[PDB]
Design a protein around this ligand. Structure first.
Ligand SMILES: Nc1ncnc2c1ncn2[C@@H]1O[C@H](COP(=O)(O)CP(=O)(O)OP(=O)(O)O)[C@@H](O)[C@H]1O
Ligand SMILES: Nc1nc2[nH]c(SCc3ccc(Cl)cc3)nc2c(=O)[nH]1
Ligand SMILES: [Mg+2]
Ligand SMILES: [Mg+2]
Ligand code: NA
Ligand code: NA
Length: 157
């Protein structure tokens, strides 16, 4: 059994309802059990143009799946929520990102864990800190509570 942490986002449709549906679907795969869920945060989009605000949260899971089996379940959940994938990035019904998989470091063409951007993202670290404050991020070797920083663009929803 491995303790893993997922980052969820939605910035189109009924964001909260899609996030709650996504959690229920994730928990329903064999080999995945949701053990904790952060508060929901409304977050300013980063890394792109002006876009609709996201709802983001993190989820703790207990899993017996390999990290690539877990990735398949995450992507399938996005498909269940009818995520659109066009030539350019745009708003999405659901994004399910693997943030941490135990203390493993995985670098494969289709998978990087810990997520390559998480340590510089308030929309990840703030909700992650609500449920994983003492979890070690194995690249930096810091606890999440030592990575998290204050960011006014992330607000409790
Ligand atoms: N830690 C991870 N979690 C989920 N997908 C990951 C991943 N690392 C790599 N990927 C790969 O990334 C591919 C594209 O996923 P997208 O969800 O479109 C990226 P995004 O989440 O919008 O950007 P972000 O990674 O900056 O958050 C997936 O098909 C998957 O194979
Ligand atoms: N707040 C926040 N910013 C994020 N940026 C990304 S990747 C680039 C990106 C892609 C499409 C759009 Cl429409 C906006 C930004 N993901 C998140 C997320 O989940 N939350
Ligand atoms: Mg993402
Ligand atoms: Mg993603
Ligand atoms: Na399950
Ligand atoms: Na790589």
């Amino acid at each position: 059994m491995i303790q893993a942490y997922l980052g969820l986002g939605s910035n189109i449709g009924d964001r909260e309802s899609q996030l709650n549906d996504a959690i229920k679907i994730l928990n329903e795969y064999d080999g995945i059990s949701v053990s904790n869920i952060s508060p929901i945060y409304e977050t300013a989009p980063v890394g792109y143009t002006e876009q609709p605000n996201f709802l983001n949260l993190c989820v703790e899971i207990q899993t017996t799946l390999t990290v690539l089996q877990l990735l398949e379940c995450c992507l399938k959940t996005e498909e269940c929520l009818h995520r659109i994938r066009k030539e350019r990035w745009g708003p999405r019904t659901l994004d399910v990102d693997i943030l941490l998989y135990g203390e493993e470091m995985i670098d494969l063409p289709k998978l990087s864990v810990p997520h390559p951007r998480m340590n510089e993202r308030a929309f990840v670290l703030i909700p992650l800190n609500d449920i994983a404050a003492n979890v070690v991020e194995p690249r930096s070797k810091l606890k999440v509570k030592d990575l998290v920083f204050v960011d006014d663009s992330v607000k409790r929803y």
